[PDB]
Amino acid sequence: PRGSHMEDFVRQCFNPMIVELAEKAMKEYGEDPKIETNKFAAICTHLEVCFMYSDGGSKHRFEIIEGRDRIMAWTVVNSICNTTGVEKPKFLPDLYDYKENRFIEIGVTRREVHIYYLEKANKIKSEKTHIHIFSFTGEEMATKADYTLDEESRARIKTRLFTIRQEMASRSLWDSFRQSE
Amino acid sequence: PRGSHMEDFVRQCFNPMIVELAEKAMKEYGEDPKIETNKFAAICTHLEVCFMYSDGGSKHRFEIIEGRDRIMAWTVVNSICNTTGVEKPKFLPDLYDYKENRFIEIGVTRREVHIYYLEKANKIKSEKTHIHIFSFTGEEMATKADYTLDEESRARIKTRLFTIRQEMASRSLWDSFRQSE
Amino acid sequence: PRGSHMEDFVRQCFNPMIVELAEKAMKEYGEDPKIETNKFAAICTHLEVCFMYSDGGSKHRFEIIEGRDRIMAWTVVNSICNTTGVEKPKFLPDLYDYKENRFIEIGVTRREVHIYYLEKANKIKSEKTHIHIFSFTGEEMATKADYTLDEESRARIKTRLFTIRQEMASRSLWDSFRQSE
Amino acid sequence: PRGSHMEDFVRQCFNPMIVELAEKAMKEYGEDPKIETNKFAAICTHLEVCFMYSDGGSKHRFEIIEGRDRIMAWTVVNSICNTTGVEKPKFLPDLYDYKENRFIEIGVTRREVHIYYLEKANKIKSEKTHIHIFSFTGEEMATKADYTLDEESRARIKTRLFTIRQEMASRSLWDSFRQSE
Amino acid sequence: PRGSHMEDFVRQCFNPMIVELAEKAMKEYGEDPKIETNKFAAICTHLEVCFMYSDGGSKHRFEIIEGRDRIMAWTVVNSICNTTGVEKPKFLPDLYDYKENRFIEIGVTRREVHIYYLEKANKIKSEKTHIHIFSFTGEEMATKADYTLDEESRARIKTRLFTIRQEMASRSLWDSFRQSE
Amino acid sequence: PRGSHMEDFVRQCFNPMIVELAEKAMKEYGEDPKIETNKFAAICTHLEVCFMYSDGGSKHRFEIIEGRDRIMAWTVVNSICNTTGVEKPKFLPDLYDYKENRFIEIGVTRREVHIYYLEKANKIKSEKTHIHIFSFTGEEMATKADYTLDEESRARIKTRLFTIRQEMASRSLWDSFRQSE
Amino acid sequence: PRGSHMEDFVRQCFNPMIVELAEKAMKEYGEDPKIETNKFAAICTHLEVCFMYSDGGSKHRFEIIEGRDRIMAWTVVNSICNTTGVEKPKFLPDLYDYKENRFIEIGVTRREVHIYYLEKANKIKSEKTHIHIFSFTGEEMATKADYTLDEESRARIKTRLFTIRQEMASRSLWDSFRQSE
Amino acid sequence: PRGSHMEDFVRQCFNPMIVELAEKAMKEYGEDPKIETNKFAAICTHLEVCFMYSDGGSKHRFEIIEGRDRIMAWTVVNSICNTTGVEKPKFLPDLYDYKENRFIEIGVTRREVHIYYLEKANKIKSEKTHIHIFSFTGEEMATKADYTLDEESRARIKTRLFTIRQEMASRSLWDSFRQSE
Ligand SMILES: CC(C)(NC(=O)OCc1ccccc1)c1nc(C(=O)NCCc2ccncc2)c(O)c(=O)[nH]1
Ligand SMILES: CC(C)(NC(=O)OCc1ccccc1)c1nc(C(=O)NCCc2ccncc2)c(O)c(=O)[nH]1
Ligand SMILES: CC(C)(NC(=O)OCc1ccccc1)c1nc(C(=O)NCCc2ccncc2)c(O)c(=O)[nH]1
Ligand SMILES: CC(C)(NC(=O)OCc1ccccc1)c1nc(C(=O)NCCc2ccncc2)c(O)c(=O)[nH]1
Ligand SMILES: CC(C)(NC(=O)OCc1ccccc1)c1nc(C(=O)NCCc2ccncc2)c(O)c(=O)[nH]1
Ligand SMILES: CC(C)(NC(=O)OCc1ccccc1)c1nc(C(=O)NCCc2ccncc2)c(O)c(=O)[nH]1
Ligand SMILES: [Mn+2]
Ligand SMILES: [Mn+2]
Ligand SMILES: [Mn+2]
Ligand SMILES: [Mn+2]
Ligand SMILES: [Mn+2]
Ligand SMILES: [Mn+2]
Ligand SMILES: [Mn+2]
Ligand SMILES: [Mn+2]
């Protein structure tokens, strides 16, 4: 495909570096952004949320695991575990919190926050890794009700998610995106 | 008109990005900066005040609504309301305060702070939206005497306004500007 | 409208400076790129063709008239006429050739090169202004068969036009664009 | 693999943009630069040769086909054919010469120039597409002995190839690279 | 003076580097751009003409003497004379032509080209230094009718001068500027 | 003078923007940095101290008066006074502290801190303007022993001053500089 | 040597400015990074640790002594001593802490933290200079158990060190590096 | 030495990249620019002359050998010889001319052009390598009276050399520099 409307919307909606990282990640997992365009938008959204999350809090509070190649990501995970003494997670997480000393798995869902958190928690099993779910509707849900960041940073993330939703809807792209998850 | 003295003064007085945003806003509302030059200076001044205001306080305390196209501005307004649960304002505001959780309408007047605040408050009706008026004389007036920012940030804004006034006066542009409002 | 597929395609297809100049031109003529999207793509295409044309030939062979505000454009036209002694054109042209000493009116058509050239020539009447028409199919037509530039520069322009056509077609935007002219 | 010596040598030997384009091309064809490192070096070398070749001659003499995604590459090929009237090649070429009006297939071999040219010519069949082979030893071979560029540009390319060879040899990487083709 | 309309027009009309060089030159000669504003515009115009002139022709055809501090300017003059064997001029010139091997004194006048050339030629006496006068009306006059540059470069300079004239006139600044010389 | 050793040392010792501001200030006061080189070094040192001082404390705690043209400097002074209600100083100060609400006059001396403070205090008379003197030996002295900034920022300034002293001494420039004040 | 695998790994592993500073330091001490490659990696690692350390804490808390030429480094040391009154250290340290008012000697070891600290403390004798040792295994050791920085900054440094270790190991470079110290 | 007047003059006289390359070259040959300052100025001058020389002529006419580390320089020399078939020079040259197919050894002397050319020619013996000597007085001398470049490029180089001479003289540095060779 030379180009879809979802792909053009993604390129005009997200920062170029985020788009390139999403393209690299999908191609690394044998996915084509030109064909799997809803997945493309999903990777971009998850990446941007991760970056805004890391931008919340102190200057070097978080180590960003997402947005790297899985080799480098696992290298940084091993280094964090071997210096802090934290259990090596079974699946690759999104961030590491040096303040709370724990890995963070970030989720962005078009369903109910409750469903996706249940899914992620069943996946990781190891309750050591903190979970934080955001929805496009504005709800959020974190392990032990410990939301890690300030209310204002989380509010910025939720506002951004709702803007993305409105933008997709105005282009008649939101319904397929919502049903795709 | 190939150029007026007010337009040249505006271009040498305000930052280029602020000038471009003011030009876009006026042209979006069917106004010509080359002809309506006092309005041009007014849009530039209001924009710069809004930006300095947002620069006061924390890094991401404010969401800037002014300086966008009204479509994007209303999109961001809808997102803020639908994530925070705040009443949708009848008229487009200037900022959103994530700390105090409220929209802000900024005003810059050449009259008395009292007159312009009365006008703006009669306009919005919805007392939910905070009002903050600055004058070129150095006075200020905010809803519930809650001035939102530090004294030093407000002082910077007032100093800038007085510098703009002096600069216009030295070019014999201040009298027409003052009588234009 | 918060966004159409033609608008997103335009933003991903053309350079940002060209997009901004097209937006300024349309808004100056009371047109909205968010609504009149085929016109948006047309202004961007015409602008890019003009810029590539000026980039053909010597370093400072051409004076670019298109892409300015009509006040500045007419100022430069008056200067060119009052220094070279060339007849002031009735309608604003696109370029001035210092080598051949003549104004150039560039056209890009989705119809037949012949039809659009007839239209432009009937418009200007003053045969002093050279006409050069390009089509999306790859044909071209210039006054007195004097094509001004090298074959290779014209070939680059025609290739670019055909790429734009293919890109629009793959997004199902080409048919409405073609029927819009 | 977290990293090989060939990969580190490639990253220190070639420009970053060339490295990124090679990585994209291999991943697009289901190849991993971290594992297939000799192929990695080969893609980087071929890309750099193509870019130097295009930099020979006039400013816009060549249209660069290599270094794009095959969708965009074939789009540009279709545009070139549909504007010039040239036969659509069966396989994607490397460049298009607007001066000589023909597609160019560039080859870089560690064997004898003669062997690789025979292979490429048997591949394309369509004698319309010009062939130009460079070797790491400094020899070259072009269709109809028409070498397209100046002697000095070709000399620059050959010098660069020999420098790459020496650099690989000093790191004991040249023998495996040579036997890999 | 905090600012005049001529000064604001100068700052919006000329490139910032040219403005800074003019300010430095005037202050070096005990002149204040804020007060002597017509002189300010004149220095900016003469500087821009000199730069466009040097930009005509080959890459390193001209050595630019104007726009330096007189110490460095005379140092470069001495070097040019002591390497080429050319007579040291009594007054500082504007350029040196390595092609024609001669110093150039550039003039921009609001009077008749003839008057100003007579004045400059009486000044230098040494007929070795070439003279080239431009007017705001579009006329030009060079020693021995040897105009040094192409017609197209000179045409660009004349067009620019006429644009400056129109811009000043639209702001009612041209009459005082014209009568000031 | 084409150049002294003090001037070359100044250009290699201080940041280029600081050098340009010092040159502008001296030329504005009819001083030549090429001749009055010890004064040149003194202006650069005073400027750098002022900038480091303003960089101490909060982001927008200080309004920088030094390093502007006296017209703009007095304009900003008038604005600060007319918005805060502070007495207009008889002589132009260096900074304004929005936190402590007072103007600051910074001094850098090669004599004893006590002598220079006595001189400055006799000069200003108006005890409203805070005084803060630094020496090249590392001593400091502020009005009412209120040193305004943290100990660490002042320590940075003193270290820088001593480095400047050592650098001048190693070039045999310090003795004349010390005796020049 | 035209290049080793350790040198290529160093160039791809560390920031270019850090690489250049390490090269300058070694060449200043008569060392060749192309030959003494384990020393090259060690200088780069020590430099990066010093820079991360200085980046911990306040904006201007630390004066960086390492990464300068020893002449400038000793000049800054003399200035710090002559302004704070601190004993001049016998050997050049790495940093100065303006908060704790003391020089810091940073060490990075592949042995046990205890051994290297004993060595450094025997070296300096003057107990005035604080010592802080990091290991590639993640341990650390500071004088008087006063670790100067936050736990999170130290954790970042330890994670980086372990990543460097893993990267060297994957290239079979870690064993020789470890045995080289 | 913390700094000499020759070193400060060198840093203010030559471009920073040229200064860094000269520093690297001297330190690579066990020379200290802070002590051997006349040699420092000589390396900078020779480097700048080489760069201006390479900038004469076509875009990629010359391969620059000077300004590299001798390992890379000899690598490029070997590549040039092994692709062109030119005799490997006994001593490292300065440039390679792809047009004339020969290595160039550039010299800059404070003596007579004749003496230094005799010295260089006795050194290389291999008459294959072209010699081109420039003097600070403005004379020049090339093998077989073949001066390779245009008269205007050579004139630019000679003018620059004379400017350097005047600048050194005004600082009383020229006599020691002249007697040092
Ligand atoms: C958005 C995405 C892929 N949705 C999803 O299906 O979840 C898969 C997942 C995987 C691991 C942990 C938790 C969930 C997602 N990916 C990750 C992620 O970590 N690595 C995937 C990198 C990638 C990117 C693009 N294509 C394939 C792979 C998330 O952490 C996350 O939250 N969402
Ligand atoms: C400076 C200005 C326009 N003066 C004014 O007449 O008030 C109109 C107003 C509108 C909404 C709320 C409150 C007041 C002004 N505009 C806004 C603003 O929000 N959107 C207007 C964008 C625009 C810019 C230029 N032209 C037309 C429209 C302000 O908020 C504000 O304070 N002042
Ligand atoms: C693409 C466009 C507008 N199509 C068209 O309808 O022709 C109108 C036209 C006008 C003058 C001469 C010849 C033709 C076009 N505009 C111009 C042009 O010069 N100024 C128009 C600036 C503008 C841009 C956007 N909206 C309104 C106005 C062309 O020269 C050209 O070729 N095409
Ligand atoms: C370094 C200097 C000039 N030494 C001095 O003789 O004091 C004169 C002075 C003037 C006003 C208040 C206090 C002292 C100095 N100048 C200023 C200053 O404000 N404006 C002078 C701008 C200038 C720059 C260069 N040349 C002439 C004028 C200082 O504030 C300061 O401390 N030192
Ligand atoms: C990594 C290194 C060199 N390993 C080491 O053998 O220690 C020598 C040392 C020297 C002084 C104090 C403490 C230890 C090291 N150098 C320094 C350092 O300060 N100046 C050396 C600059 C240099 C760089 C490269 N080659 C030669 C010299 C350290 O402070 C440190 O910790 N490690
Ligand atoms: C300016 C210099 C060093 N004067 C000189 O004594 O001549 C020595 C020489 C060497 C080879 C061929 C011809 C002459 C000079 N160096 C070179 C040069 O090539 N490599 C030297 C790199 C270097 C830089 C700094 N320190 C030590 C070595 C020249 O080519 C040249 O002309 N002058
Ligand atoms: Mn996740
Ligand atoms: Mn408002
Ligand atoms: Mn047209
Ligand atoms: Mn190929
Ligand atoms: Mn002149
Ligand atoms: Mn002061
Ligand atoms: Mn250390
Ligand atoms: Mn040489």
List CB contacts of H79: < 8 A, sequence separation 6 or more: D158, D159, D160, D161, D162, D163, D166
Tokens standing for H73? 């320089």
Task: Give chain F's domain count.
Answer: 1
Q: What is the resolution of this structure in A?
A: 2.3
Q: Between helices E151-170 and E5-13, what is the axis angle to 10°?
A: 150
Token pair 């003009």 in the structure block, residue? C50
Tell me how crowded residue G107 is: count the other CB atoms within 10 A of its CB.
Answer: 19
- Which stretches of D59-129 are assigned E, i.e. beta strand? 62-64, 95-97, 102-109
Contact yes or no for F60/B152 (Cβ under 8 A): yes
Contact yes or no for F116/F139 (Cβ under 8 A): no
Pick E75's closest partner by Cβ from F2, F72, F75: F2
Residue type, F1: P
From the candidates A24, A27, A39, A120, give the one annotated as an active-site residue: A120
Half-sphere exposure of E55 (CA within 13 A, CB side): 14
Token pair 């575990």 in the structure block, residue? A81
* Residue H108 main-chain phi, psi, to 5 deg: -130, 120
Tell me how crowded residue A145 is: count the other CB atoms within 10 A of its CB.
Answer: 6
- Report the C-alpha gap between D53 and C176 in whole angstroms: 40
Listed residue (C105, C152, C151, C162) closest to C128, CA to CA: C105
Tell me the best of H91, H94, H132 to mutate to test the pocket of ligand 6, counting ligand atoms within 8 Å of each CB and taking the most: H94
* Residue D95 main-chain phi, psi, to 5 deg: -140, 165
Listed residue (A49, A60, A145) closest to A94, CA to CA: A49
Tokens standing for E161? 């001068």
Token pair 């013996």 in the structure block, residue? H125
Burial of D49 (0-12, 13-18, 19+ CB in 10 A): buried
From atom 23 of ligand 2, which residue's Cα is the shortest distance away?
B25
Q: Is E57 left (phi over 0), alpha (psi -120 to 50) or beta?
A: left
Q: A71 and D30 in contact by Cβ < 8 A?
A: no
Q: How far lies D101's CA from each of C56, C155, D130, F179, H65, in Å?
A: 18, 10, 10, 77, 37
* Residue A146 main-chain phi, psi, to 5 deg: -95, 100
Domain limits for position F157: 1-181
List CB contacts of H58: < 8 A, sequence separation 6 or more: D152, H99
Residue type, F135: S
- Report the C-alpha gap between G85 and G78 in whole angstroms: 10
- Report the C-alpha gap between B96 and D71 in whole angstroms: 44
Annotated binding site of H for Mn(2+): 46, 66, 94, 105-106
Which residue intervals of chain B are DSSP H helices?
5-13, 16-28, 37-55, 70-84, 113-124, 151-170, 174-180
CB contacts, 8 Å: C60 with chain E: 55, 152-153, 156
* G vs F contact (3+ beta-carbon pairs below 8 A): yes
**What is the per-residue DSSP string for F141-164?**
EEGGG---S-HHHHHHHHHHHHHH
Tokens standing for C117? 């050239």
Residue type, C107: G
Q: Is D77 left (phi over 0), alpha (psi -120 to 50) or beta?
A: alpha
3-state secondary structure of A4: coil
> What is the sign of the dihedral through the CA atoms of F40, F43, F47 and F50?
positive
Residue type, D125: K
List CB contacts of E175: < 8 A, sequence separation 6 or more: E169
Contact yes or no for B163/B153 (Cβ under 8 A): no
Cα angle for residues C52, C56, C60 (degrees, 5° grid) = 105
Tokens standing for B112? 């008395």
The protein residues having their C-beta less than 5 angstroms from ligand 13 (an ion) are: G 94, 106
Per-residue burial over H27-65, b if 16 or more Cβ lie within 10 Å, else e, is: beeeeebbeebbbbbbbbbbbbbbbbbbbbbeebbbbbb
CB contacts, 8 Å: D75 with chain A: 2
Contact yes or no for C78/E166 (Cβ under 8 A): yes
**Rg of chain C on CA atoms, in Å:** 16
According to DSSP, residue A145 is labeled: G
Tell me the best of G21, G29, G31, G46 to mutate to test the pocket of ligand 5, counting ligand atoms within 8 Å of each CB and taking the most: G46
The reply to whether D66 sits in an annotated binding site is: yes
According to DSSP, residue F56 is labeled: S
CB contacts, 8 Å: G75 with chain F: 163, 166-167
Burial of B139 (0-12, 13-18, 19+ CB in 10 A): middle
From the candidates F34, F120, F123, F125, give the one annotated as an active-site residue: F120
The reply to whether A46 sits in an annotated binding site is: yes
List CB contacts of D57: < 8 A, sequence separation 6 or more: D99, D148, D149, D150, D153
Q: Is the CB of G106 under 6 A from ligand 5?
A: yes
Q: Between helices H16-28 and H37-55, what is the axis angle to 10°?
A: 120
Residue type, H29: Y
- Report the C-alpha gap between F119 and F111 in whole angstroms: 12
Q: Tell me how close the Cα of F66 comes to any Cα of chain H, in angstroms.
A: 26
List CB contacts of F119: < 8 A, sequence separation 6 or more: none
* Residue F6 main-chain phi, psi, to 5 deg: -65, -40
Q: Identify any residues that bridge with F105 across adjacent strands, giving them in sequence order.
A: F131
- Tell me how far the alpha carbon of residue F92 is from its chain's centroid: 12
Percent helix, strand and coil across chain C, each rounded to 5? 55, 15, 35
- Which stretches of E13-157 are assigned E, i.e. beta strand? 62-64, 95-97, 102-109, 130-135, 140-142
According to DSSP, residue B149 is labeled: S
Listed residue (A57, A72, A137) closest to A104, CA to CA: A57
Contact yes or no for H111/H136 (Cβ under 8 A): no
- Report the C-alpha gap between C1 and B69 in whole angstroms: 11
**Rg of chain A on CA atoms, in Å:** 16
- Report the C-alpha gap between E137 and E159 in whole angstroms: 9
Contact yes or no for F103/F73 (Cβ under 8 A): no
CB contacts, 8 Å: H55 with chain E: 60
D120 is catalytic: yes
- Report the C-alpha gap between H145 and D49 in whole angstroms: 36
> What is the sign of the dihedral through the CA atoms of C99, C105, C111 and C115?
negative
Q: Please give the order of strands across the beta sheet that includes H95-97.
A: H62-64, H95-97, H102-109, H130-135, H140-142
Listed residue (C58, C63, C51) closest to C92, CA to CA: C63
* Residue E78 main-chain phi, psi, to 5 deg: -60, -40
Tell me how crowded residue G93 is: count the other CB atoms within 10 A of its CB.
Answer: 23
List CB contacts of F179: < 8 A, sequence separation 6 or more: none
- Report the C-alpha gap between H171 and H180 in whole angstroms: 16
According to DSSP, residue A56 is labeled: S
Tell me how crowded residue E36 is: count the other CB atoms within 10 A of its CB.
Answer: 15
Contact yes or no for A138/B81 (Cβ under 8 A): no
- Report the C-alpha gap between C138 and C25 in whole angstroms: 26
Tokens standing for H144? 């077989």
